[PDB]
Amino acid sequence: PPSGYGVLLATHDDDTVDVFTSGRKMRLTCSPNIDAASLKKGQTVRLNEALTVVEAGTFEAVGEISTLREILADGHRALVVGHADEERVVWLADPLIPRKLRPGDSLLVDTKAGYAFERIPKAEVEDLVLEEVPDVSYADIGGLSRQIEQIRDAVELPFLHKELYREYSLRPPKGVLLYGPPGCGKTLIAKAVANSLAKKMAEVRGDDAHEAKSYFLNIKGPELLNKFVGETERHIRLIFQRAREKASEGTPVIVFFDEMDSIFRTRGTGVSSDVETTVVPQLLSEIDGVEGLENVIVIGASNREDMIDPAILRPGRLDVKIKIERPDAEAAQDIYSKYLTEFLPVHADDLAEFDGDRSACIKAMIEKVVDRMYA
Amino acid sequence: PPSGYGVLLATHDDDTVDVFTSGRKMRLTCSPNIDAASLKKGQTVRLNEALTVVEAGTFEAVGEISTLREILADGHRALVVGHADEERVVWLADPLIPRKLRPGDSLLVDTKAGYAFERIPKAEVEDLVLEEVPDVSYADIGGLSRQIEQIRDAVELPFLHKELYREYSLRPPKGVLLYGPPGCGKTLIAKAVANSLAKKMAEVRGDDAHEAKSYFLNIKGPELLNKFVGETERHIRLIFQRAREKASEGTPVIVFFDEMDSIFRTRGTGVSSDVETTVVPQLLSEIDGVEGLENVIVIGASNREDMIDPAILRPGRLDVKIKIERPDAEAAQDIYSKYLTEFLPVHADDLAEFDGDRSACIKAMIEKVVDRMYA
Amino acid sequence: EVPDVSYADIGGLSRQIEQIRDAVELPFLHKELYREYSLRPPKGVLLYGPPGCGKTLIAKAVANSLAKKMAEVRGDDAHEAKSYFLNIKGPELLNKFVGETERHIRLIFQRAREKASEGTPV
Amino acid sequence: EVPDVSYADIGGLSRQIEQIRDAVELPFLHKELYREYSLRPPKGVLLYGPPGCGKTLIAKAVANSLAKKMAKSYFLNIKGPELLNKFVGETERHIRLIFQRAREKASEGTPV
């Protein structure tokens, strides 16, 4: 009953297998029950005091993680650099030999065994910001109809009809800007497009919430700003790389930058610090460069349109500049209707004149109040 | 009976379990006297000379503390860093699957077995935010009855009456701005609110001592200013994350931004300094962002109300604006009554005119002094 | 990955493309004639102008032309016929450590000198 | 740092000595009588006037006299231009550290 464990290394025609066990490299025969043909490199296997492979298992899930350097010519090996700049050539297991393994990846490796298993990003931090998706939708936003139409055309429309766009040789917009006076409702649209995207992703592929949320990234502002030189730029590089994996020409990845003025400037307006002077060219290269993002939409929101650098506010980077204006009388009526719902309790005195009709009473109250305030 | 110890890893339907023992992983059977189903992942279990589990214990060990970076998608493993910048993936223990686990929290981990047994909360502690409970109470403030009632309705009333607001579907205010001339009293009301919150969390709820200290997160303006790029941003994010994690349903967490005028100021004002284009957007996005606060009230006191930026003064961030005014004659009489108490030693010749009646004597002195200053 | 932009996809600039095409190809198109006049090929080309005027467009066209040329001359399309174009983002070479970025500079230029030949531009 | 200047060294400013005594010296002599009477002791003294007249001498003499009267008192002398740095926030953090040390010393109850 007490049985050991080991890591598979390679297979031979002798029906024998190389296994790393107890910190040493050994060769074993397999049990008649197990078929050595189905084994794959890097699989975990179970052993015994007689030193026989009895059962195969799933790959290792814990251990040291190292940054991938390059993939060797043979394709079964790759160079990985450890935490203290130690470099080692390690075999690539079956799962890596899915998405193509590319350098700049943090592969989970067992240095003594010399095998890489999987890799994980750290940009999740941003994906961790929107832990709960807002429940607001376009039905809960009033006073803006043309803007909602434009924002739907920018995002939803290209993906609803891909074949029509292909026939007309038109690609989805690369970027969207939202600008207007404070409080006019920019964050509402920004947090409602996220809800719509989550609903779409859930209904199309799978009901899992995490994967649905994994397509909207919330920068939240100066979160990218860091202490050390050349670290925030690498953070932006990682953000955009993680964005480019998740795009499949049928799935949009929305990277929302809030308060554009925080990290974006003219490169000359900076007085105390000019970190933006380094940050801006990196992101400009990421958006449009030698290699461009095929199906990534960057939605930007700001309160001061002029402070933003002219390079970003260029067609082909921020194609549609949606402007939200201060509400008029009809927009005020719509906003009031969105809040003064019929289900709100109302006094019997107000109900007396309109024979208890809640809807008409509340409606007339809405015009009365908007008329009072718009005088 | 000399008996060993090991760390449980996973359970199987064969009633046999994998245990890390003597630095290597063992598949071992369980004794009939211990239930295998009752076991939990990452459990310290007893062994013997025949390598059979005989007892199960607490998840107590001595281990290095690793700063938690992110939890994996599968929800069972998390990435952590080390003192030497060593990043490793570790399975979560049963208690860590409790308060929600967040990045930046220390975890006790045994790197050989790779399990995070528990989280150490004292390591991430902020004593700069904590404030000593003031002796000042509501009865100690005079001449500001309207402002006291307004701040009561803003802060204390919503949590006292929750079902009543839910019936009307009203959310608690998400910000209070005390503002006015110098000295007229702004810090005094903050002290009174802190004392009331301390009492409410002390005797009404009865959690423990120092729990009242935890709430009313108090930070002065200049304290947030730091020497690096994007270091104040980290402090803002940390304090708001602490406020978010401490606040529960019906539990108020109040952050006092004393001296709101000097801190933040107005963006684009001040040639000498440019801290404004970095700090003001972090606060603008933490409050009323894509993900909003639940039961957090931000109280800001300013002697220069107009100096503060308008984007953080518009409704939705600082809704309830309370203005402190200069005392009038009746207000001055009340303030004198708040200090000219009857416990002060009164001269006998002073009491001669009223036959030793100290209450009437002191009231008359207050009237005389008020008349003298207001003549 | 090699972009598909070619010279036929650029319009309104028939003079600048001529200059860059000459500076890239002619020293290698006619090496014997260049050595006849002892003319050293230029080693610095700068493209400057207002935003969104075609600078990256010309860069992509040049990269595509070089990749096609090297695919014609030899093989190993996997990395060869493309390794000769090195795309570097602006802040990409910036590094946290004190001397690592300088080492990156020296090492990049060292490889660019190694891979280069009299017939193969880098 | 132990101040050594005494009131005897100061000449011609005895009246200033008697005002400065009534704000720091007297309160800690019989503080019990004040908390009985509920008086709030003073908090800050600003010595202002033409320079080179012995402003520092008055403060050092007061500190030395208070130390001699106590039967443990702690005194901090920090010059102005030291609290100045071009980087953002450093001058404030120095003040925070100074006052943190002040609270550390005052926590026992000895005069600071």
């Binding site: 050390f228 030189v229 105390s272 | 020497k227 790029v229 | 450590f97 004190v98 | 980087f87």
Partner: peptide, 17 residues
């Protein structure tokens, strides 16, 4: 005399065992 923030550059450290 405008005040300015700074960005520091780390120096790698070597530790064995």
């Amino acid at each position: 005399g405008s005040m300015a923030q700074e960005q520091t550059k780390r120096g790698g450290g070597g530790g064995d065992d």
